Structure formats: C-alpha cells, structure tokens
Amino acid sequence: ILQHPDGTVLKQLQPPPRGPRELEFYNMVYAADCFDGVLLELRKYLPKYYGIWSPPTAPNDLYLKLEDVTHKFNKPCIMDVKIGQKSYDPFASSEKIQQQVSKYPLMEEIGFLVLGMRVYHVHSDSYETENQHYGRSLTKETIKDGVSRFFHNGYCLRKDAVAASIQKIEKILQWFENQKQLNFYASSLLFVYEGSGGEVEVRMIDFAHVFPSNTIDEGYVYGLKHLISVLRSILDN
Numbered sequence: 001i002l003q004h005p006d007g008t009v010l011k012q013l014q015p016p017p018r019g020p021r022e023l024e025f026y027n028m029v030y031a032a033d034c035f036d037g038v039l040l041e042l043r044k045y046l047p048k049y050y051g052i053w054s055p056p057t058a059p060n061d062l063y064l065k066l067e068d069v070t071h072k073f074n075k076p077c078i079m080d081v082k083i084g085q086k087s088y089d090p091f092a093s094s095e096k097i098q099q100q101v102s103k104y105p106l107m108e109e110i111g112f113l114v115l116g117m118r119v120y121h122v123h124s125d126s127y128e129t130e131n132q133h134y135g136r137s138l139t140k141e142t143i144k145d146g147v148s149r150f151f152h153n154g155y156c157l158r159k160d161a162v163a164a165s166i167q168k169i170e171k172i173l174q175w176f177e178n179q180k181q182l183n184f185y186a187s188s189l190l191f192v193y194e195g196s197g198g199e200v201e202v203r204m205i206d207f208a209h210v211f212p213s214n215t216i217d218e219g220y221v222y223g224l225k226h227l228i229s230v231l232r233s234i235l236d237n
C-alpha cells in the first residue's frame with residue numbers, strides 16, 4: 001500500500017488472476033451507470049474507488065487508487081481481519097485448498113483471522129505492530145484476548161472503540177443479510193480508531209476472490225457474527 005497525494009492510497013494489483021479480479025470487482029461496484037441497490041449500498045463499506053492508476057511513464061504498472069481510510073485519524077490504530085470460513089475460492093484446486101487451509105486451519109471454526117495490527121501506545125508515544133504470525137497463532141482459547149490487544153492503549157481497554165466497531169460491523173452484516181449475488185473469500189475488514197471517543201472506521205477490503213453467487217455468503221456471515229460475539233464479550237472485561 002502506497003500513499004499518493006493526500007487522502008488516497010495506491011494498491012498494486014496482485015499477480016493474475018488475483019489483481020485483475022480485484023480490479024474487475026471495484027469496476028463493477030463503482031460503475032458510473034450502476035443503479036443496483038445492493039451495489040450502491042456496498043459502496044458505503046468500501047474505500048472510495050478512484051479508478052485504475054499507473055505511473056505516467058509506466059502503463060504496465062497497475063494500481064487501484066483508493067481512499068485512505070486512515071486519513072481523518074491523528075494516531076490511527078489499525079487492525080486487518082480476514083473474514084469467512086474458507087479463504088480459498090470455489091475454483092481452487094486441491095493443492096490450493098490445502099495451501100489456504102494450512103495457512104490457518106482454524107478458519108472454519110473461528111470464521112476470521114487477524115492479519116495484523118498496529119496499536120498506538122500513549123505511555124511510550126510509539127506503535128506496537130503484530131504481523132501475520134500473531135493472528136495465525138490464535139486459538140478459540142486465545143482469540144478474545146488476541147482481539148482485545150488491538151483496543152489496548154496501555155492505560156485502558158478502549159470499550160468505546162469496541163462498541164463502535166460492533167455497531168459498524170452490524171451494518172455490514174445487514175448488507176450481507178440482504179444480498180445473494182456476491183460471495184467473498186479471503187476478504188478483510190480494516191478497523192481503525194483514534195489512538196491519540198467512539199470514532200471508528202470499519203471498511204471492507206481485499207477483493208481478489210469475490211465471485212457471483214445465488215446464495216447468502218454464509219461463511220462471511222458466520223465470521224462477522226463470531227467477530228461481533230468476541231467483541232461483545234470484550235465489553236464485559
């Protein structure tokens with residue numbers, strides 16, 4: 001993710017087929033002449049999309065120009081959570097399914113995976129980052145405390161940010177409850193709150209594996225609900 005002139009980010013297209021599919025997804029959702037109510041509502045929950053972008057002298061080098069969802073924050077605390085029971089898509093080979101399940105074999109049970117987090121700590125004026133291996137080490141036994149860490153400034157548990165996150169996720173859940181045209185695999189939610197009350201961004205990102213469907217995205221729904229339940233339990237801390 002690169003920064004660009006302010007308020008936006010450039011996301012480089014992943015290698016094919018992933019990049020082209022993510023391009024296609026944003027193009028579909030933000031089609032000028034789209035009057036599909038499902039897709040118009042979905043725009044609210046994504047970064048605003050400004051189209052394909054390439055450097056002036058490098059048409060080969062393909063990015064998505066996207067809203068910087070952290071732009072309005074002073075000291076943003078950010079968590080990326082992959083959502084769903086399966087992070088492989090409907091046309092994955094046996095090798096690919098195994099490859100994806102082995103990255104985090106608890107995906108079916110938990111329905112989400114923390115990809116990373118960056119948390120501003122007040123006491124030290126510094127950031128604490130967790131990588132891929134943090135969330136992949138979390139179990140049913142440790143997921144609640146694993147998620148809680150995101151809302152720790154090192155003075156208090158930010159239950160205001162936790163409650164706001166639940167309320168924002170609930171809207172996304174409602175959108176999923178009201179559509180049967182897209183299924184999302186290996187897609188994520190980006191949570192942002194202010195680390196420097198109740199002010200949160202939750203946006204959907206990572207759309208290299210979104211496919212046409214004629215069913216409710218049940219794995220996504222499962223994950224969102226479990227994530228809501230975990231966040232809700234954290235409000236009892």
Ligand SMILES: O=c1c(O)c(-c2cc(O)c(O)c(O)c2)oc2cc(O)cc(O)c12
Nearest residue numbers: 001009047066067068069070118205206
């Ligand atoms: O707007 C975005 C953003 O700010 C970040 C981001 C992610 C991190 O993991 C950070 O540590 C950070 O500072 C920013 O990612 C994104 C990823 C997307 O696919 C789309 C986006 O629009 C953003």
